Each structure stands twice: as C-alpha cells, then as structure tokens.
C-alpha cells in the first residue's frame, strides 16, 4: 500500500530520470556515460515499478540504443548463445518498439532500413562476408523498400569490393544519431520530474 506504492512511485521517477540522462549522453556522443547510466537502469529494473506502459516503452528504446551502441563489435553478443550480432538483435528490438508504440509500417520502414544496412555493412567492413550474406538474405530478401540497396550489397559482397561508395560513405556515428532522432520523435519529450524538482531546488 502507501509504503510500497511510495517505493514504486520513486523507482519510476528515478528510472525515468536516468533514461533522460542516458539519451542526453547518447545525443552528445558520450557513450561511456551512456553505458554507465544503462548499468544503473539495469540494476533498477528488477525493483517494483508497478505496471506502466511508459517504463516498458522506455526499456525497449533503451535496449535498442544499447545494441546500436555496441554495434561495431561483432564479437559482442546480447544473447547467451552468441548467435546474433548486436545489430541483428537491434532489429528484433525495433519490431517490439513498432508494436508497443503502435507505429505504422510507413513510420518504421525508413529507420528499419538503416539498421539492416548498418548490420550488413559492418560485417562487410570486417570482411565477414558469410555473415553479411546471411543477414542480407534473412533481412532484405523479402522487404520491398530494401531491394535497391540489397542489390548493391550482394554485388559488393561477391566482388569483395570495400571501395564501393556505399561502403566508403557509411558513417557509423551518423547512423547512430539518425536512429536516436527517430526514437526520440516517438517519445514523450517532456522533462523528467526529478530534473524539474532539482531545477526548482537549486533556483
């Protein structure tokens, strides 16, 4: 009751606050700060939070950014079997986000295209062509908006052509920030209660 409902309320404020700081850190390319804040939120999620759609949505976005942040490390794994690269995992998270945010396919398709493209290109950049082909086959063979790009990538892989413009013009920093603006555009962009209270208290 009014002892556990107090704990749940504060835990929600604390979570929502660090979520905001995590986004600010990511936005400023401060990924060391992001990873530290992520670890705080990780320890926080096991606490009672009640059942809000808002903390669930929060965590999915937080999951996507985490996988994108580690996206250039193909030796890193988010599943206990190391089957998937972080960007393959990010694709799975994005679909959960589309569902939970009740998004239209037209709204999601452009940014999903970005993640798929990045997943393959990183593999190519690391000369992991078998992996590139697999990801390409599993994520672009049956996707209407990716066909034009899918065609460029097959040829790049088969010719082992790292000097192709599609590869050379790719910027992972640019990719990350594009994904963030997409995710932030579907977020309640209001300042967290704790920050607002701190602004009053220090005023």
């Amino acid at each position: 009751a009014g002892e556990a409902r107090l704990e749940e309320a504060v835990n929600r404020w604390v979570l929502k606050f660090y979520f905001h700081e995590a986004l600010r850190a990511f936005r400023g390319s401060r990924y060391g700060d992001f990873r530290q804040i992520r670890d705080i939120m990780q320890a926080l999620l096991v606490r009672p939070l009640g059942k809000e759609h808002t903390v669930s949505r929060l965590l999915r976005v937080m999951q996507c950014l985490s996988r994108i942040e580690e996206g250039e490390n193909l030796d890193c794994s988010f599943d206990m079997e190391a089957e998937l690269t972080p960007l393959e995992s990010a694709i799975n998270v994005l679909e959960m986000i589309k569902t939970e945010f009740t998004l239209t396919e037209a709204v999601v398709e452009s940014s999903r295209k970005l993640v798929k493209e990045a997943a393959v290109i990183i593999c190519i950049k690391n000369k992991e062509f078998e992996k590139a082909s697999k990801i390409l086959k599993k994520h672009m063979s049956k996707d209407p908006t990716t066909q034009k790009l899918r065609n460029d990538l097959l040829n790049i892989i088969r010719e082992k052509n790292l000097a192709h413009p599609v590869i050379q013009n790719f910027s992972y920093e640019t990719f990350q920030q594009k994904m963030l603006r997409f995710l932030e555009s579907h977020l309640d962009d209001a300042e967290p209660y704790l920050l607002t209270m701190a602004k009053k208290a220090l005023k």
Binding site: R38, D39, Q42, A82, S89
Partner: peptide, 15 residues
C-alpha cells in the same frame, strides 16, 4: 530466438 533475454529486459550485452 532471444525471446527470454528480451522479456528479461536485458539492456547490457551477454558477453
């Protein structure tokens, strides 16, 4: 499948 680490709301990486 991932399914079970996802439901767990795992933010940081397995390894």
């Amino acid at each position: 499948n991932r399914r079970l680490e996802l439901e767990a709301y795992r933010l940081g990486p397995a390894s």
